Motif scaffolding. Sequence first.
Motif, PDB file in Angstrom:
ATOM      1  N   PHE D  12       0.850  -1.212   0.000  1.00  9.18           N
ATOM      2  CA  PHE D  12       0.000   0.000   0.000  1.00  9.18           C
ATOM      3  C   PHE D  12       0.874   1.246   0.000  1.00  9.18           C
ATOM      4  N   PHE D  13       1.929   1.160   0.797  1.00  5.59           N
ATOM      5  CA  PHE D  13       2.867   2.277   0.988  1.00  5.59           C
ATOM      6  C   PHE D  13       3.707   2.472  -0.259  1.00  5.59           C
ATOM      7  N   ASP D  14       4.047   1.340  -0.873  1.00  7.00           N
ATOM      8  CA  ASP D  14       4.849   1.357  -2.099  1.00  7.00           C
ATOM      9  C   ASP D  14       4.036   1.967  -3.249  1.00  7.00           C
ATOM     10  N   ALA D  15       2.803   1.490  -3.396  1.00  7.66           N
ATOM     11  CA  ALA D  15       1.885   1.979  -4.442  1.00  7.66           C
ATOM     12  C   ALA D  15       1.538   3.457  -4.238  1.00  7.66           C
ATOM     13  N   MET D  16       1.387   3.851  -2.971  1.00  6.42           N
ATOM     14  CA  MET D  16       1.104   5.242  -2.589  1.00  6.42           C
ATOM     15  C   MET D  16       2.252   6.167  -3.002  1.00  6.42           C
ATOM     16  N   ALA D  17       3.458   5.776  -2.597  1.00  4.37           N
ATOM     17  CA  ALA D  17       4.653   6.597  -2.818  1.00  4.37           C
ATOM     18  C   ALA D  17       4.966   6.724  -4.311  1.00  4.37           C
ATOM     19  N   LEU D  18       4.779   5.611  -5.011  1.00  2.00           N
ATOM     20  CA  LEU D  18       5.022   5.538  -6.455  1.00  2.00           C
ATOM     21  C   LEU D  18       3.973   6.338  -7.237  1.00  2.00           C
ATOM     22  N   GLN D  19       2.729   6.325  -6.760  1.00  2.00           N
ATOM     23  CA  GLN D  19       1.657   7.144  -7.350  1.00  2.00           C
ATOM     24  C   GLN D  19       2.013   8.642  -7.312  1.00  2.00           C
ATOM     25  N   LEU D  20       2.775   9.029  -6.293  1.00  2.00           N
ATOM     26  CA  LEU D  20       3.185  10.431  -6.106  1.00  2.00           C
ATOM     27  C   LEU D  20       4.633  10.681  -6.518  1.00  2.00           C
ATOM     28  N   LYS D  21       5.235   9.701  -7.196  1.00  3.18           N
ATOM     29  CA  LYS D  21       6.611   9.822  -7.709  1.00  3.18           C
ATOM     30  C   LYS D  21       7.624  10.145  -6.594  1.00  3.18           C
ATOM     31  N   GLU D  22       7.419   9.520  -5.437  1.00  2.00           N
ATOM     32  CA  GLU D  22       8.318   9.702  -4.292  1.00  2.00           C
ATOM     33  C   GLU D  22       9.002   8.375  -3.944  1.00  2.00           C
ATOM     34  N   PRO D  23      10.329   8.335  -4.096  1.00  5.90           N
ATOM     35  CA  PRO D  23      11.145   7.156  -3.748  1.00  5.90           C
ATOM     36  C   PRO D  23      10.865   6.796  -2.283  1.00  5.90           C
ATOM     37  N   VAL D  24      10.685   5.506  -2.037  1.00  2.00           N
ATOM     38  CA  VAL D  24      10.294   5.006  -0.708  1.00  2.00           C
ATOM     39  C   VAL D  24      11.160   3.819  -0.287  1.00  2.00           C
ATOM     40  N   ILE D  25      11.397   3.788   1.004  1.00  2.00           N
ATOM     41  CA  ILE D  25      11.970   2.615   1.678  1.00  2.00           C
ATOM     42  C   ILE D  25      11.043   2.237   2.839  1.00  2.00           C
ATOM     43  N   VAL D  26      10.884   0.942   2.986  1.00  2.17           N
ATOM     44  CA  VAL D  26       9.977   0.378   4.000  1.00  2.17           C
ATOM     45  C   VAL D  26      10.731  -0.699   4.787  1.00  2.17           C
ATOM     46  N   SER D  27      10.944  -0.454   6.071  1.00  2.00           N
ATOM     47  CA  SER D  27      11.667  -1.440   6.897  1.00  2.00           C
ATOM     48  C   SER D  27      10.892  -2.769   6.932  1.00  2.00           C
ATOM     49  N   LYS D  28      11.654  -3.823   7.183  1.00  2.00           N
ATOM     50  CA  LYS D  28      11.139  -5.205   7.259  1.00  2.00           C
ATOM     51  C   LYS D  28      10.135  -5.425   8.392  1.00  2.00           C
ATOM     52  N   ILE D  66      11.633   8.776   1.073  1.00  2.00           N
ATOM     53  CA  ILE D  66      10.734   8.651   2.238  1.00  2.00           C
ATOM     54  C   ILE D  66      11.021   7.309   2.947  1.00  2.00           C
ATOM     55  N   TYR D  67      11.650   7.402   4.108  1.00  5.43           N
ATOM     56  CA  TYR D  67      11.957   6.227   4.937  1.00  5.43           C
ATOM     57  C   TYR D  67      10.821   5.941   5.915  1.00  5.43           C
ATOM     58  N   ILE D  68      10.283   4.727   5.859  1.00  6.69           N
ATOM     59  CA  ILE D  68       9.151   4.338   6.722  1.00  6.69           C
ATOM     60  C   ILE D  68       9.579   3.169   7.622  1.00  6.69           C
ATOM     61  N   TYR D  69       9.550   3.454   8.917  1.00 13.92           N
ATOM     62  CA  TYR D  69       9.858   2.477   9.974  1.00 13.92           C
ATOM     63  C   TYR D  69       8.668   2.324  10.924  1.00 13.92           C
ATOM     64  N   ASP D  70       8.649   1.211  11.649  1.00 13.47           N
ATOM     65  CA  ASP D  70       7.818   1.118  12.857  1.00 13.47           C
ATOM     66  C   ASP D  70       8.374   2.099  13.880  1.00 13.47           C
ATOM     67  N   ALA D  71       7.463   2.742  14.591  1.00 16.44           N
ATOM     68  CA  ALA D  71       7.824   3.706  15.644  1.00 16.44           C
ATOM     69  C   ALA D  71       8.757   3.084  16.695  1.00 16.44           C
ATOM     70  N   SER D  72       8.576   1.795  16.945  1.00 18.98           N
ATOM     71  CA  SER D  72       9.400   1.043  17.911  1.00 18.98           C
ATOM     72  C   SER D  72      10.874   0.885  17.490  1.00 18.98           C
ATOM     73  N   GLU D  73      11.196   1.313  16.272  1.00 16.88           N
ATOM     74  CA  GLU D  73      12.577   1.297  15.749  1.00 16.88           C
ATOM     75  C   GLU D  73      13.399   2.518  16.143  1.00 16.88           C
ATOM     76  N   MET D  74      12.703   3.560  16.590  1.00 16.56           N
ATOM     77  CA  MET D  74      13.374   4.771  17.084  1.00 16.56           C
ATOM     78  C   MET D  74      14.269   4.399  18.280  1.00 16.56           C
ATOM     79  N   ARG D  75      15.484   4.906  18.233  1.00 16.26           N
ATOM     80  CA  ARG D  75      16.459   4.679  19.314  1.00 16.26           C
ATOM     81  C   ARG D  75      17.211   5.971  19.644  1.00 16.26           C
ATOM     82  N   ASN D  76      17.999   5.889  20.708  1.00 14.21           N
ATOM     83  CA  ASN D  76      18.876   6.990  21.125  1.00 14.21           C
ATOM     84  C   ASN D  76      20.342   6.571  20.944  1.00 14.21           C
ATOM     85  N   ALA D  77      21.138   7.525  20.503  1.00 11.72           N
ATOM     86  CA  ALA D  77      22.588   7.341  20.343  1.00 11.72           C
ATOM     87  C   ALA D  77      23.282   8.647  20.717  1.00 11.72           C
ATOM     88  N   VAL D  78      24.461   8.501  21.292  1.00  7.48           N
ATOM     89  CA  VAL D  78      25.233   9.648  21.797  1.00  7.48           C
ATOM     90  C   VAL D  78      26.440   9.839  20.873  1.00  7.48           C
TER      91      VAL D  78
END
Lengths: 137, 137, 137, 137
Positions: D12-28, D66-78
């Motif tokens: 859905f996300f791939d078809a959406m992004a492609l419909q709007l000519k926006e390169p997309v990545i979707v995490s596993k 456009i990078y699409i991740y699950d929110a649970s993938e957000m992390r902290n790094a110093v």
Amino acid sequence: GFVAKDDSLRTFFDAMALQLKEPVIVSKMAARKKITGNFEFHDPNALLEKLSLQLGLIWYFDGQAIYIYDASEMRNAVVSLRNVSLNEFNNFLKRSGLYNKNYPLRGDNRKGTFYVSGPPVYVDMVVNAATMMDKQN
Amino acid sequence: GFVAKDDSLRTFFDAMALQLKEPVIVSKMAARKKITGNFEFHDPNALLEKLSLQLGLIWYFDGQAIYIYDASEMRNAVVSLRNVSLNEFNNFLKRSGLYNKNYPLRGDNRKGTFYVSGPPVYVDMVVNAATMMDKQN
Amino acid sequence: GFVAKDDSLRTFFDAMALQLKEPVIVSKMAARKKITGNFEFHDPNALLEKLSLQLGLIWYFDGQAIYIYDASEMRNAVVSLRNVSLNEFNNFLKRSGLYNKNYPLRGDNRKGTFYVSGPPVYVDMVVNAATMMDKQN
Amino acid sequence: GFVAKDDSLRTFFDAMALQLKEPVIVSKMAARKKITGNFEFHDPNALLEKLSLQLGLIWYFDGQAIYIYDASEMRNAVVSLRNVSLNEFNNFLKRSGLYNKNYPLRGDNRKGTFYVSGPPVYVDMVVNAATMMDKQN
């Protein structure tokens, strides 16, 4: 409540613990008796003590798993920390959820030395905690 | 109570101990006799002493397992700690649940030396406890 | 709402978490019970606490994944940084989204030492964050 | 607009992004949900936020993909540069096309140290830019 013409004690203890949603471990020697007949209307704590008295079992619960051994598995071991004083070590081992004949600890005459008397998982847990607390000191 | 036209002594002792929920060990030589006939109305302590007298057996109980040997297996061994005084060693070996002819210990004339006279599991337990207590000192 | 004559607890928890679009992890021991029957009209937080009480489970949520363990998996670990003071370390570990019995931390008597008591992912996350903060100092 | 009885969210996300000519990545993991039904008359920004809210997704756009991740993938790094001051580093990282919850950066108490909190491609881009700017200094 349970009835059976014959099953291994191990299976009675497993079914009992699982009926009460309590993780259980049963030593290879603790069990190896057979049980026959029926228990009914028996309060769970009473089933455990009666099974333990007849089969000569001692149990140890640490808030996570109920460890069931033959009473003859209880041993003595001496712990003598090198860097930490025994009084401080006891202050860390001591807990309100400690149980025994299965898991008694006491200071002995040998300098900076306590004796741990109880089932194998006792001695292993206290010894490992000992070694770590000593390495920290 | 038990009847049989012929079974190994080992099997009588095993069935006896198991009937009373007492873990048992039977040496390879302690047993090797055969038993024939019937016992009945016999108090358990009496069965054990009568079996032991006829087959020339000596038993050792340590609160965990009943060790049954031929009386001819009893030996003497001398323990001479290097770092710990023999009087202190005895203070640690001594217990109210000690049993003998099977497991007697006594100080001898040889400096800082005691003699342990009894079945193999005696001598092995006292010797091992000895070596550990000596290493602590 | 869910009905079943029998499925693994693991599958109930998985279906529950997925129904609410919440990433879930279920330990190999947390689960291994079976569930039978029907839940209905049950508020989600209530289903989670009731499942946890009956199966003796403790959960940990870190804003990303809901970690579900058996309560018996909770352990204690001591962290003693070498270069950073424990008070500063706590200032960095502390958060308003911290959860416990599953994940409690507290300073102990041992110099520059805190104890982390909780499920495995707790202890692993706090320990790793610890080691990194210590390497920075 | 799109209808389907069932396809992977990823599609859905791939078809959406492609419909709007926006390169997309979707995490596993960002994806692995399923979608069913129909969207229509939906403004594109609204489809993205609604998909993200329901599936618990966070996206990151850097003007290229456009990078699409699950929110649970957000992390902290110093990040603690060795040769360059953190204030100068921020002056180079800062941009008017920066986006967040997905990609926030801020100075922390730790000397010459900032914390990057966001999806993986955030942390990787900022860390790499960091290391290069530090090597130049």
